Amino acid sequence: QISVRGLAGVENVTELKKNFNRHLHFTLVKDRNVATPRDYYFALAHTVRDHLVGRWIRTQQHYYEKDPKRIYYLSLEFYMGRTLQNTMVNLALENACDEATYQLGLDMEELEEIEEDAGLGNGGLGRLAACFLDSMATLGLAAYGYGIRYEFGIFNQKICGGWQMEEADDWLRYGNPWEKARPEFTLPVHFYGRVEHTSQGAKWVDTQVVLAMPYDTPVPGYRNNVVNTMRLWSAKAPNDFNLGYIQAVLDRNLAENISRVLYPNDNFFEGKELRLKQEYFVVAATLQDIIRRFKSSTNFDAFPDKVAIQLNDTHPSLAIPELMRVLVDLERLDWDKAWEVTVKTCAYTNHTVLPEALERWPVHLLETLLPRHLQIIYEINQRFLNRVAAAFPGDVDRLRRMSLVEEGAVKRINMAHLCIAGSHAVNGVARIHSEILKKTIFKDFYELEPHKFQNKTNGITPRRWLVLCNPGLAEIIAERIGEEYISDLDQLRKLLSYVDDEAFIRDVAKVKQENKLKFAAYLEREYKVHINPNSLFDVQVKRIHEYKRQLLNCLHVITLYNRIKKEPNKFVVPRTVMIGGKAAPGYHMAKMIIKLITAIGDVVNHDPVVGDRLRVIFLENYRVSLAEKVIPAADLSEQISTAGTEASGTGNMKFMLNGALTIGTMDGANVEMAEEAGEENFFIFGMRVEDVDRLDQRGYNAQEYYDRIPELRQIIEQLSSGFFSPKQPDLFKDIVNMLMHHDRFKVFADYEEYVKCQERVSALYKNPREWTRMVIRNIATSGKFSSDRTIAQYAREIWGVEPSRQRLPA
Ligand SMILES: OC[C@H]1O[C@@H](n2cc(-c3ccc4ccccc4c3)nn2)[C@H](O)[C@@H](O)[C@@H]1O
Known part of the structure; x- marks a missing residue:
């Protein structure tokens, strides 16, 4: 029909039609006599998905051989929307599929309307992550999006008598053809417990274990044959969980609630335990995966040369003390060296200046849930404040202003302060916003370390x-x-x-x-x-x-x-x-x-x-x-x-x-x-x-x-x-x-x-x-x-990698 939608070649159209018919029969177990529009959608989705797999396996093979620096984008939100048309566009398949479906007597635009939005975000912050994944693949970066696979995304809004009503977004009801469960790569995540001190350092013991099961979704670049991965973690109880009998099995839901639902707040902080569990869950599973992949290339000096971790706001800020925990408690690195690695690895993006949107976690919550991380945070704070004191001697109010620990009725940890301390780069998302950060809320930090502060205007x-x-x-x-x-x-x-x-x-x-x-x-x-x-x-x-x-x-x-x-x-x-x-x-x-x-x-x-x-x-x-x-x-x-x-x-x-x-x-x-x-x-x-x-x-x-x-x-x-x-x-x-x-x-x-x-x-x-x-x-x-411009700037100015528009072989 139109030029930008690609070629509809005789060979391609014929092949698409037969694979559509194969999926309808073998995959959906239907024939044309009983098939609904939904069945036709799924047959099309499976047909297009097949075109991704070869590219997906070869992209990941390519990264293993070339061993480039890897970019890990950590976010609690990925607002992806629909995937079918996007995949067709990036693979140059739109006109061919349009033709193939027309010849089968189907309207493709009607089929596209059947797909549910993957609504795993609230708005701008979640959508930015989605645009970013698209641009990273298009620019040929070895990039991975890491998040949570929520069973329920942002609620569906109904208007009744002029009022908003909420209903559960059951987006997985009919299945998700785009994801691939990877139960073989399931990782354990620890909660609660207590800290023991030995001659050979600290040990975190008597913990409760929740399993993190990954689901992988392909992220195709624009006509470059690159297919990156978004890996989303799902919560699973271990098999000996609570193990009268019936209740013990039913109680598995408690562990699995971690990945059940997206918190529906835009630009507002709600200090609930379930949310904190979600934040640690994504961070703990992701970091194990990162380190595993790094070891499969002893010497952690090269870690920042092979790994970049981008924190999408403070939501995954626990990556900082979790990386320290692993390096110090498990790999037995000395503090100063572990800290150097952490700082050079992490970077932080701020998305708001509204005081009610800043994450400030009660100490008593972290004490019960993550006792070792609190100890590490206190140690980070002490060492950071010793640096402030040395740079601005006698300035006692600066010390209390810059502390990661906020005093008051309830003591809180300021997660934004944690992020600045433990990152080599801090950026705002538009020029005026980044200037406001340096002039107002992070002024003290800008005065101590001006080199950290950057701008990266959104796209x-x-x-x-x-x-x-x-x-x-x-x-x-x-x-x-x-x-x-x-x-x-x-x-x-x-x-x-x-x-x-x-x-x-x-x-x-x-x-x-x-x-x-x-x-x-x-x-x-x-x-x-x-x-x-x-x-x-x-x-x-x-x-x-x-x-x-x-x-x-x-x-x-x-x-x-x-x-x-x-x-x-x-x-x-x-x-x-x-x-x-x-x-x-x-x-x-x-x-x-x-x-x-x-x-x-x-x-x-x-x-x-x-x-x-x-x-x-x-x-x-x-x-x-x-x-x-x-x-x-x-x-x-x-x-x-x-x-x-x-x-x-x-x-x-x-x-x-x-x-x-x-x-x-x-x-x-x-x-x-x-x-x-x-x-x-x-x-x-x-x-x-x-x-x-x-x-x-x-x-x-x-x-x-x-x-x-x-x-x-x-x-x-x-x-x-x-x-x-x-x-x-x-x-x-x-x-x-x-x-x-x-x-x-x-x-x-x-x-x-x-x-x-x-x-x-x-x-x-x-x-x-x-x-x-x-x-x-x-x-x-x-x-x-x-966002191609935006991502090119992150690549060059923060991650230290060069974007590439060169094609991978098809
Ligand atoms: O950078 C991408 C966009 O990010 C928007 N934004 C910010 C947030 C946000 C900020 C703080 C939060 C704290 C707790 C929970 C959710 C939060 C969401 N959600 N969306 C910003 O409001 C918008 O200005 C910007 O374009």
Whole structure:
């Protein structure tokens, strides 16, 4: 059908068809007479999977012979989404499979919709890990993703009476064709127990044992025949566990609960024992696997030359004292040498500056669960603080500020401090974020060891986030500049010479309209809701949080509604406002925000005077597969976090690559995006970081804004009096109270500029030609935000390895 989707050769199509029929018969034990769409999906998945295995075995063989430095990316989250189409794209199989299935009388796009998302993450941090795995394979690095195979991923979100309801994400119900269980490589993990001191050092004894069973999933590079591995650990009880009889067998569930469920919190720390167990489980099993592989190449001096461990936030921070434990207690290395190895091996990436998101574990928890690790942490702390004292003599407050141990009612360990101490590199995820780290929360550490601190601006994979989800746009780009940009996104700059090209302008606008029509149809077919495809698609999709300010968006929506009600027969640019994302189950305010959005929709969508000029839709169950649908359809991307709160954002980059314009604050990666495209081509508004600081020093008074802005006053009065909740007039009292008396994120402070900026958006949208020309300038300068660039920087500046675009033999 289209160029970028590969060749459909006679030989390939014939071979695909027969292997599809083989799997249906032998693997699924079905015939065409009883087969369902689901059976057809699985036959296709198995057929494509077969094409991976040869490459997978030969890639891993290649690494064994060449013995390169290995990269271990440790994360508690891998937000993978669907795998079928991604695999076809990276193997150049999409058109061939499309043809093969067509000839069998099947629609492949229908089959693709059957696959469950692998939802083993919450949002941005989990998705970054997934994009990173794709780029590492594409860049030919010997890289392994290590995590937990959760039985239940992020919950499925249902909306009932405007409220979020959670249901279990039973993603393994029908099986996972992409994983391979590896029970032969099962490893033991220890918990509890006590420490004994002997003449021959410390020993950790009387422990409870949980088995870690690995499951391997292939990670194909883009058309380079490289297939890397994501290894996810599953918890298993040992066979003598608790071994009246029946109860002892039933009690095995206690051990196996470790890998049962993903903690559903975005940017928020919950200090529960089960979570700590998950963190150690992944770390202990992973490190044994690493050391085993290293020994199969005595001398640990070469360890940092052959191993890099990247910590995705502090969640796997126990890798630091666990590596020390192994080197000191088991390999019998002296402390100083073990520490040198550890530091040179580990690197740490921070993803937030919000105080409530920082991991601070109660000492009493670590004392019971991991008694030896606590001892090691204390020793790390003592030695680190002796270094601080020597560098800054007499500075007693610096000592208490920098300590890994926090004093108070309950003593806690600051895991971020642990990570900085035990890593050779610490990075933030966008330039402004990395600067904030050096200037504020890690200032003391930057003063002691400035060389450790780096920036690595985030990126997204252009495979999933352009070629896969937006083939129409990928194709029109390929028509002009070729296909090489797919693995070299900087080449999109060549599109600047097409900004006054009348054919290209028409094609860019055509692709967007097609995307909007397709998405408008999706909403009717699957959710029975009517939208106008000619309206401006105004979208804010991401996890619900106060810092992300979905509430500011809400205020604008109501402002637009109130202005229409005031002057009904005045022309306004029609908008479809779409807001989606999940709230953490215990996050009350976020659940209230969802209810507000739906409540506004209930008033706005049924007002006859409004017509089809304004629609407010809550996008249910936002997840990777839904992102792939809505992002290509968007006209306006809402990136409106209070300056200084969104470390980077990655959703922003997805919208930029797919032809939406951005309205946003100068926060996270928005700053670099505007810098790349030109500020004239971005809708920037609101306080900068410096303005927020000035407001904090003076004291933020929300009443001031309420008093001086009549349009804002009206909205607050509407919310208070029960305009949006007639049956329950006080339903939104918590929201109003928060806004008026304890708003950490200064919603009112940016309201006027936001509304003004939104008017400028509507003005430009009235001129289709100039809207599209600005879009082209955005797409053309989005190259920096490829995760290929990001990973190349980690490789060269942190891991000390060279990326390669060279093919492995097929
Ligand atoms: O770096 C990738 C993205 O990471 C996002 N993020 C951060 C987190 C996060 C931070 C701290 C946590 C602490 C405990 C549990 C979960 C956590 C998640 N989840 N997502 C950040 O919010 C976003 O700015 C960034 O683009």
